[PDB]
Structure formats: structure tokens, C-alpha cells
Amino acid sequence: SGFRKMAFPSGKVEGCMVQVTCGTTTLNGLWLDDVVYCPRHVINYEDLLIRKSNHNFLVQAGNVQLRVIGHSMQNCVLKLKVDTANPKTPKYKFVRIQPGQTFSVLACYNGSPSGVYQCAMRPNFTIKGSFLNGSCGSVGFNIDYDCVSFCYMHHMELPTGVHAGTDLEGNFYGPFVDRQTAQAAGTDTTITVNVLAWLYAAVINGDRWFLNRFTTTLNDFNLVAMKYNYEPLTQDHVDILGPLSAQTGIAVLDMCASLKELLQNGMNGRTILGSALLEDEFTPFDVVRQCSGVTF
Amino acid sequence: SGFRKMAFPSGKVEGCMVQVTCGTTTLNGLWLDDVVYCPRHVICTSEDMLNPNYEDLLIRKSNHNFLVQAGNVQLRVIGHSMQNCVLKLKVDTANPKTPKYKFVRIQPGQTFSVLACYNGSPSGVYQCAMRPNFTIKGSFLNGSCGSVGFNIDYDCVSFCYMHHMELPTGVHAGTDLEGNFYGPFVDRQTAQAAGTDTTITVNVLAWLYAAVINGDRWFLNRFTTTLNDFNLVAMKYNYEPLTQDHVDILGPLSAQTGIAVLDMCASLKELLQNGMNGRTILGSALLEDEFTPFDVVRQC
Ligand SMILES: O=C(C[C@@]1(C(=O)Nc2cncc3ccccc23)CCOc2ccc(Cl)cc21)N1CCN(CCCO)CC1
């Protein structure tokens, strides 16, 4: 029993964090094989990069300086070719995630991991992270068996305190640019499929007060959901919620009628899994993984 | 900016998780140097669990009865001893991934990261607080026994908890790494209940200072309070008493934000009286008590 915001074990990623210094700027880099990936703002990026030489980039893996033997840019990520392959390189992939998907963030400062937390890619493409100056280059990831899927690299903090970054190919999530200019996070919405997954987790843990005899059509639920700034629930979401629906004996459209009532009436001084708000940062897979005990 | 429930990076602890099997039972062990630490109830059956005599059960065991597995490598147990509720299995190989570590016993209100494991394999890491009733509101399924709680300040791993049991309310009980249980719990299946839980007042205040550091001031007020008047109001909402130590501890955050500790105490009093009014503090509609003053300073 128990339901916690749980991050993936960060060990495979910790062995990859390095410190990248270029001029006055110091941020984090991801050392995989003989390449160090980091935000290109560490340095007109084509013009700024051409002026740099390999010895300008000081890379440090622990107390060992890695010598840069080449550099190239891929979108908003700088790829620094190093002479030494990372002996701690795990099995990895670069994956681009969709809004609503969750990942673990290994927050780093000066190439040293300081903390790990579970995030969600918001529907407005920002992440509500916890980052201070020097956290740029910190990565987001998931673990599948023994494979690390890198999905995020931190680049900036928007004026509202929310964070923006790219996938490991340097493509930003959201309409953001790596430039000091006026940029604002769009109005955010609630990840509906994730809220339903968290309601199933609450039922698995013994919380049933919110359940009701009612059901709803997928269309009627989406008309209500749109009114409360909730993302539309697709047939794919209903299908993905299948396992949890079968395990608890509560159909997805039956849980949608509970969600609809929670939206129109509130909690009424009650909590669900120790929360007075509807939690949307657990995917259906996160609930299954935690309420079954999958290991890495 | 931003305030998240943040766990310590678990890498230093992952390199220590092993699987310990004894008879039908399989749980987790912590392999540090040439010793594997694990809950002593690994030597029990459900027929023993009501009134186990661990000294008697242990004397009947031999080293080859304990099957220890570090990854896909079976370790050889060359000795065993019991220290309180933890079994110490001497093995013939020192763990090459043994980090710099300490065994620390924590006080209620203290936080730590939990590396939840099954079959010696890490499945997840989350943050916990030792509740005032000495339980932890963890996330553990069967097979998680032996999963450890820790803090990682300055490259050293301070092990503070080893998971042993789940109480009937879904909360968890365990020991420090010397085998001493936190709370009035015993490693027996006899009737045991967690005492009434209370909110960790100093942690709530630390989280209100974190909210002020992050720009949330809506809950602040023009009032102050005496420490005694605050405690009289606090006890009525099932909040732990705030001691002069807690007030002293909150000093740095008070100086950084310019809000006197007893001034923040008066804001807490008001929140307890009025609730949030549809507002949130750091993305929460409840007063959060699982961030210590040290956690707030570290993260902010
Ligand atoms: O898992 C246990 C320990 C056990 C316990 O609490 N285990 C668990 C821990 N966390 C989460 C759980 C989630 C669901 C179910 C069990 C969980 C069983 C329940 O009661 C106690 C009372 C005291 C003590 Cl110290 C330990 C326990 N055992 C079963 C009994 N025995 C194994 C012998 C084979 O039957 C020994 C091992």
C-alpha cells in the first residue's frame, strides 16, 4: 500500500553527468559514449560556434578533465566530441515524449547530481520543475527494463517559474526559443487520462468515496472536461486505462462520471491519496508500475 | 524557481541492493563492504511471525541457508550475526560499489529518500518523512522488506531506515541500520497500530517560507503570536508542538524572507482557521509537512 510520486532510480544517469564550462558559463552535460550533450546557450549560434575552438570547452567528469576533440550543433543542443568514451554509458535511446507523459529529472549543478524528481510534460509543453541557476543541461528520462530513454534536457526558466527544454536532439518542447526575449507559457490544462489513472490508483489503495453508480458517454464527458480546462479524453486514453478498469471493476466511463462529479462539486473537505487537488502527474503506466512493483 | 518533493540521487544506494533468500522468503539486503544487512524476519515463516524467538531460529541456520544474490552473482555467506532486528550476513566479497556511508538514527519530522526494491532490484525512489507517530507513509508492496531510507549530503550516504513492515492502516514501520525500530513496533504479527498521526509543524512553517521565497505571499498577515498561544491553537488541529529549537532552526529562513518565525506562526494559525479558500500554496491545496527547514534551504 501507499502511493507516492516516484522517480526512476537515477544511477544509470548519474554516471553520465559532467560539468561543461565555456567562458564564464558553467552548466551540465550528458556524457554518452564519446559525446557530451549540453544546451547550445553555453556558448546567432552558427556564428558564435565557428569562433570557438575545442580547448575553449572545459569538460569535467568528476575530478577528471575530458578533452574535447570536436564540436557540432544539432538544433538547440551542442554535441562535444570527447577523446574518451564514458565507461558508465548505459543502454540508452533518445525519445521525444508527448504532453501528459511523465519522466524523472536528475537536477544537477556543476556536473553533480543533487536531486531526482518525477515530472510531467504539461499540455502547454512546460514542466513544473525545481531548478536554480546552473541547472541547465539537467536531463529528464525514463527506464524501460535496463534501457534509459532520455527525453528532456533543461534549457530555461520562464517568468512564471515553469521550465522549458528540449529533447536530446535539441528540439524544444513547446513554442520556445533559446534566447533572452519575451516568452510566456501558454494557459495550461489538466492531463485528464492521468487524473483518471490516479483515481484508479486511489481505488487500488482503498479510497472509494468518490465512486458513484453513474456512467457517461465519452462525448458528454469531453463537453464537461473542456469547461474545466481539462484535456480531451480520447478512445486511446480509454483503451490505455483498460488494465486498471479491469483490475478495479470500474469502467473508464464509470470513472469519468466520478471525475465529472468531482469537477462540478469539489472534494468537500475530503482527500484522495492525501491530496485535496486532482493529481495529473501519474500516467496509467506509472500507476500500473507502482501498484505492481516493476524493477530496474 | 519551483518547489518539488525531491529525492536524493539513488545511484550510491542502487549499487548496494542485493536479494536475500532464506527458505521461502525473499527480500532485500544492503551490501556495504563485506556485510549484507537485512530484516531479521527473513529467517521466519508465517507460523513463526506471531511469537518468533529470533535467537533460537538463527542458531538453527547455517551460512549456506542464506542465498545472497548481487545482480546475477551469488554471494557466499561466511558468517551471520543479529543486531537488534537486523540480520548482518558476513559475505566473502566486499562490495566494490560501497560508497562513503554512515548509519544515522533520525528523529520524527526528518525526511529521507526511499529506494523501493523487489528481489534486490531498485524499482523507484521517492521522498518520505519520519512521522511523529514513528511510521512512514511509504509505497511498499510484498517483497519490499529491506528497502532503505537515506540522505546524501556531501558525497556520504547516511542510511537511516530499513523497511520491515506494513501496519493495518497502510503505513510503514522499520528500523535504523542498527536494527532498532522507530516507534513502539516489534517485528511480530501481533496486533500493532500506529498511534494518532500529527502534522509536523516545523516542516509546515519551512514549506510556508519556501512558498514566500518562490513569490507566494497571499497567506501572510499583519499578526504575530506568542510561542505558547501558537501551540495552544496548533494542538487543536493535531499539529505537533513547536519548540524553541524549531524556532531557532527556522532562523535562517526568517532572516532570508524578513518574516519573523512567530509572524509566520500567525499566518499558519490563520490558514488552520480559514483553510485555503480555493487557493494553493506551492501547487498544493493542503499544508505540506514533509519538507524540513534544511530541505527548503537546500532546494531554494
Ligand atoms: O512480508 C512479510 C513481512 C510482513 C509485512 O508487513 N510485509 C509487508 C511490508 N511492506 C509492505 C507490504 C504490503 C503488503 C503486504 C505485506 C507488506 C508481513 C505482515 O506482517 C508483518 C508483521 C511484522 C513484520 Cl516486521 C513484518 C510483516 N513477511 C511475510 C511473513 N513471513 C514470510 C513467511 C512466508 O509466509 C516473513 C516476511
Kindly report the backbone phi and psi dihedral angles of residue A20, in degrees, each rounded to the nearest multiple of 5, phi listed first: -115, 120
Question: Do β-strands B148-153 and B35-39 pair in parallel, antiparallel, or remain unpaired?
Answer: unpaired
Quote the CA–CA distance of A164 and A138 in Å, as a whole number: 12
Question: What is the CATH superfamily name and number for domain A189-292?
Answer: main proteinase (3clpro) structure, domain 3 (1.10.1840.10)
Look up the CATH number of domain B15-99.
2.40.10.10
Please report, for residues A16, A98, A246, the alpha-carbon distance to residue A240 in angstroms, rounded to integers and kept in the order given.
33, 15, 11
C-alpha cell at A199: 483515481
Q: Which residues of A are catalytic?
A: 41, 136
What's the reported resolution, in angstroms, to a tenth? 2.0
The sheet with strand A35-39 has its strands ordered as: A64-66, A57-61, A17-22, A25-32, A35-39, A77-82, A68-74
As for chain B, the residues directly before each break of C–N over 2.5 Å are: none
What residues are in contact with ligand 1 under a 6 Å CB criterion?
A 1; B 24-25, 41, 44-46, 49, 140-142, 144-145, 164-166, 187-189
Annotation marks residue B41 as catalytic: yes
Q: Are B50 and B6 in contact (CB under 8 A)?
A: no
Quote the CA–CA distance of B245 and B250 in Å, as a whole number: 9
Please report, for residues A34, A35, A287, the alpha-carbon distance to residue A67 in angstroms, rounded to integers and kept in the order given.
10, 11, 43
A67: which residues sit within 8 A by CB, 6+ positions away? A54, A59, A82, A83, A84
Please report, for residues A18, A19, A78, A169, B172, the alpha-carbon distance to residue A14 in angstroms, rounded to integers and kept in the order given.
9, 12, 20, 20, 29
Please report, for residues A112, B112, B221, the alpha-carbon distance to residue B294 in angstroms, rounded to integers and kept in the order given.
19, 12, 25
Q: Are B92 and B69 in contact (CB under 8 A)?
A: no
For B92, counting Cβ atoms within 10 Å of its Cβ (0-12 exposed, 13-18 middle, 19+ buried), the class is: exposed
C-alpha cell at A192: 485528464
C-alpha cell at A246: 479491469
Q: Are A55 and A106 in contact (CB under 8 A)?
A: no
Cβ distance B286 to A295 less than 8 Å, yes or no, reads no
Q: Which of B22, B38, B41, B164 is catalytic?
A: B41
Length of chain B measured in residues: 300
C-alpha distance across the termini of chain A, in Å: 20
Quote the CA–CA distance of B4 and A124 in Å, as a whole number: 19
Cβ distance B11 to A8 less than 8 Å, yes or no, reads no
Distance B167 CA to ligand 1 centre (A): 9
Choosing from B166, B175, B181 the residue with most ligand 1 atoms within 8 A of its CB, the one to mutate for a pocket test is B166
Q: Are A81 and A69 in contact (CB under 8 A)?
A: yes
C-alpha cell at B184: 513502539
CB atoms within 10 A of CB B263: 17
Distance B18 CA to ligand 1 centre (A): 18
C-alpha distance from A3 to closest chain B C-alpha (Å): 5
Comparing CA positions, the residue from B43, B19, B41 lying closest to residue B118 is B19
Cβ distance A162 to B2 less than 8 Å, yes or no, reads yes
Q: Which residues of B touch A103 (CB under 8 A)?
A: none
Domain with CATH 2.40.10.10 in chain B: 1-14+100-197, 15-99
Question: Do β-strands A91-94 and A147-157 pair in parallel, antiparallel, or remain unpaired?
Answer: parallel
CA quadruple B264, B267, B272, B278: dihedral sign? negative
C-alpha cell at A231: 484535456
User: Which 3-state string (H, E, C) describes chain A?
Assistant: CCCCCCECCCHHHHCCEEEEEECCEEEEEEEECCEEEEEHHHCCHHHHHHCCCHHHEEEEECCEEECEEEEEEECCEEEEEECCCCCCCCEEEECCCCCCCEEEEEEEECCEEEEEEEEECCCCCCECCCCCCCCCCCEEEEEECCEEEEEEEEEEECCCCCEEEECCCCCECCCCCCCCCCCCCCCCCECHHHHHHHHHHHHHCCCCCCCCCCCCCHHHHHHHHHHCCECCCCHHHHHHCHHHHHHHCCCHHHHHHHHHHHHHHCCCCCCECCECCCCCCCCHHHHHHHCCCCCC
Q: Whose CA is nearest to atom 27 of ligand 1?
A: B165
C-alpha distance from A234 to closest chain B C-alpha (Å): 27
Kindly report the backbone phi and psi dihedral angles of residue A18, in degrees, each rounded to the nearest multiple of 5, phi listed first: -130, 165
Cα A51 to chain centroid distance, Å, stands at 34
Cβ distance B119 to A295 less than 8 Å, yes or no, reads yes
Domain with CATH 1.10.1840.10 in chain A: 189-292
Look up the CATH number of domain B198-300.
1.10.1840.10
Look up the CATH number of domain A15-90.
2.40.10.10
C-alpha distance from B55 to closest chain A C-alpha (Å): 31
Quote the CA–CA distance of A5 and A9 in Å, as a whole number: 13
Q: What letter represents residue B140's amino acid?
A: F
Look up the CATH number of domain A1-14+91-188.
2.40.10.10
C-alpha distance from A52 to closest chain B C-alpha (Å): 31
Cβ distance B280 to A275 less than 8 Å, yes or no, reads no
CB-nearest to A157 from B1, B12, B172 is B1
Q: Whose CA is nearest to atom 25 of ligand 1?
A: B187
Q: Which residues of B touch A271 (CB under 8 A)?
A: 286
B133: which residues sit within 8 A by CB, 6+ positions away? B108, B183, B194, B195, B196, B197, B198
C-alpha cell at A60: 569535467
Comparing CA positions, the residue from A168, A76, A94, A165 lying closest to residue A126 is A165
Q: Are B27 and B42 in contact (CB under 8 A)?
A: yes
Cβ distance A161 to B214 less than 8 Å, yes or no, reads yes
Quote the CA–CA distance of B185 and B173 in Å, as a whole number: 7
Q: How many CB pairs under 8 A join A and B?
A: 136
CB-nearest to B126 from A5, A206, A271 is A5
For A53, counting Cβ atoms within 10 Å of its Cβ (0-12 exposed, 13-18 middle, 19+ buried), the class is: exposed
User: Which 3-state string (H, E, C) describes chain B?
Assistant: CCCCCCECCCHHHHCCEEEEEECCEEEEEEEECCEEEEEHHHHCCCCCCCCCCHHHHHHCCCHHHEEEEECCEEECEEEEEEECCEEEEEECCCCCCCCEEEECCCCCCCEEEEEEEECCEEEEEEEEECCCCCCECCCCCCCCCCCEEEEEECCEEEEEEEEEEECCCCCEEEECCCCCECCCCCCCCCCCCCCCCCECHHHHHHHHHHHHHCCCCCCCCCCCCCHHHHHHHHHHCCECCCCHHHHHHCHHHHHHHCCCHHHHHHHHHHHHHHCCCCCCECCECCCCCCCCHHHHHHHC
Comparing CA positions, the residue from A273, A293, A284, A283 lying closest to residue A120 is A283
Nearest residue in A to B3, CA atom: A130
Quote the CA–CA distance of A136 and A156 in Å, as a whole number: 7
Quote the CA–CA distance of B21 and B14 in Å, as a whole number: 18
Exposure letters A257-269 (e unless 16+ CB within 10 A, then b): bbbbbbbeeeeee
C-alpha cell at A244: 486498471
Please report, for residues A89, A218, A248, the alpha-carbon distance to residue A112 in angstroms, rounded to integers and kept in the order given.
16, 47, 42
Cβ distance A10 to B285 less than 8 Å, yes or no, reads no
Domain B1-14+100-197 is found in CATH 2.40.10.10: yes
Q: Whose CA is nearest to atom 30 of ligand 1?
A: B46
CB atoms within 10 A of CB A55: 8
Quote the CA–CA distance of A259 and A220 in Å, as a whole number: 12
Domain with CATH 2.40.10.10 in chain A: 1-14+91-188, 15-90
